[PDB]
Design an enzyme around this catalytic site. Structure first.
Site, short mmCIF file in Angstrom:
data_model
loop_
_atom_site.label_atom_id
_atom_site.label_comp_id
_atom_site.label_asym_id
_atom_site.label_seq_id
_atom_site.Cartn_x
_atom_site.Cartn_y
_atom_site.Cartn_z
N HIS A 91 0.94 -1.15 -0.19
CA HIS A 91 0.00 0.07 0.11
C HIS A 91 0.81 1.32 -0.05
CE1 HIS A 91 0.87 -0.54 4.32
NE2 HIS A 91 1.39 0.70 4.23
N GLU A 103 5.82 8.82 5.19
CA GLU A 103 5.91 8.87 6.52
C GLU A 103 7.24 9.06 7.16
OE1 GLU A 103 3.26 5.23 7.20
OE2 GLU A 103 1.81 6.82 7.58
#
Ligand SMILES: Cc1cc(C)nc(SCC(=O)c2ccc(S(N)(=O)=O)c(Cl)c2)n1
Ligand SMILES: [Zn+2]
EC number: 4.2.1.1
Length: 257
Positions: A91, A103
């Site tokens: 993902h 992230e």
């Protein structure tokens, strides 16, 4: 209840998942100058020749391409790992704008997006059991920057309009995840966690130094997806990333330089 908004976003997760404030949370900023080169780290071994993709799903947080993980078909081993890890799904996390989305950060630099290829330790027999173990998962993270198209991403990009809203899924066979890899397998590694709830501290993070390049049109197609379900008010699926978390008592190791 959890998501990526003002009222249910990362800042709120600790109320439902107190380990949000734990000792080995992810992601982190990779400080390239203070990461420790470790000459005993092995090359990473990515064996994805026999990968069997099955389906793609919008889960209301991202989209997941899921693999048949009932045999040793697509595995990760070597690197910092002392066990075999089976690919279960990948993902991405991405932003509303090209200047954010990743992230992990590198010397505080954010990338447009981040690919997570999620693998679980075959000594624990299945993904549900692995996540309950400190060495249960190995997640290979790859940065995406915007520039030239990634041809290996195109089949993913082309099916997204079939899974626009939460809970939609589509068959997605014969997708080859080798087409998402950069040239180099040089990496940083540290012990961390899932970056979404339940935030379990069960991940050996392996983050590739070399980003892949995707086109503005490829990443635009990501931002057309929806957090909401079919027939609910439209919230574009953008900014589904957790920010950098305190490194605390951890050293990031590098396989290179
Ligand atoms: C069958 C299956 C597979 C996966 C990856 N997650 C789930 S539940 C969500 C989950 O546990 C999960 C979410 C996000 C991540 S991340 N962002 O790569 O750290 C991981 Cl490793 C697991 N279920
Ligand atoms: Zn992820």
């Amino acid at each position: 209840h959890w998501g990526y908004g003002k009222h249910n976003g990362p800042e709120h997760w600790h109320k439902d998942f107190p380990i949000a404030k734990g000792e080995r949370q992810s992601p982190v900023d990779i400080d390239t100058h203070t990461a420790k080169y470790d000459p005993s780290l092995k090359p990473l071994s990515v064996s994805y020749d026999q990968a069997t993709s099955l389906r793609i799903l919008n889960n209301g947080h991202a989209f997941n391409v899921e693999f048949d993980d009932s045999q040793d078909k697509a595995v990760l081993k070597g690197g910092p790992l002392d066990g075999t890890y089976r690919l279960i799904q990948f993902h991405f996390h991405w932003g509303s704008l090209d200047g954010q989305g990743s992230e992990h950060t590198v010397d505080k630099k954010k990338y447009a997006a981040e690919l997570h290829l999620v693998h679980w330790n075959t000594k624990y027999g299945d993904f549900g059991k692995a996540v309950q173990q400190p060495d249960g998962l190995a997640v290979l993270g790859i940065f995406l920057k915007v520039g030239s198209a990634k041809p290996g991403l195109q089949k993913v990009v082309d099916v997204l309009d079939s899974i626009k809203t939460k809970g939609k899924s589509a068959d997605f066979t014969n997708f080859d995840p080798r087409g998402l890899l950069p040239e180099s397998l040089d990496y940083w590694t540290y012990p961390g966690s899932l970056t979404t709830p339940p935030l379990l501290e069960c991940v050996t993070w392996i983050v590739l130094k070399e980003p892949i390049s995707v086109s503005s049109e490829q990443v635009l197609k990501f931002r057309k997806l929806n957090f909401n379900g079919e027939g609910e008010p439209e919230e574009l699926m953008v900014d589904n990333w957790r920010p950098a978390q305190p490194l605390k008592n951890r050293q990031i190791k590098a396989s290179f330089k």
